[PDB]
From a paper:
Using biochemical analysis and structural characterization, we here show that HsDus2 uses a unique strategy for binding and modifying its tRNA substrate. In contrast to other Dus proteins, HsDus2 has a dsRBD, which is the primary tRNA binding site.
This extension is made of a short β strand (β1) that interacts with the βββ fold, thereby forming an extended β-sheet followed by a long unstructured linker and a short α−helical turn (η1). The helices of the αβββα canonical fold pack against three antiparallel β strands as generally observed in classical dsRBDs such as in Xrpa. Lys371, Lys419 and Lys420, located in conserved motifs as well as Arg397 are conserved basic residues among the dsRBDs and they are known to participate in the interaction with the dsRNA. To illustrate how the dsRBD of HsDus2 might bind its tRNA substrate which contains some dsRNA regions, a structural alignment of HsDus2dsRBD with the dsRBD of Xenopus leavis RNA binding protein A in complex with dsRNA was achieved.
Residue numbers in the entry: 348 to 441
Amino acid sequence: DTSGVIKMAVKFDRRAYPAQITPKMCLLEWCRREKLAQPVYETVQRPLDRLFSSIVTVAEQKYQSTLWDKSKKLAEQAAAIVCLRSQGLPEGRL
């Protein structure tokens, strides 16, 4: 079952990665090596609180952080982390 949404409580911290290396980049490259569709991100907002989330779809499965972020870009990195971590894949961490 590739249904519903898989979630983890994660946040993107650039200090966890080498310079110019991000979870989004790592997820894109994993999809390219496995010849899967490229990841698709969809933005979720709570505009009242100035908050963002993102749901990423990879191999027909949706992934999303349980946490909310201050920007769309930061939320997308969090979604990519959930996708990588929940599958036990490397995310480019130091």
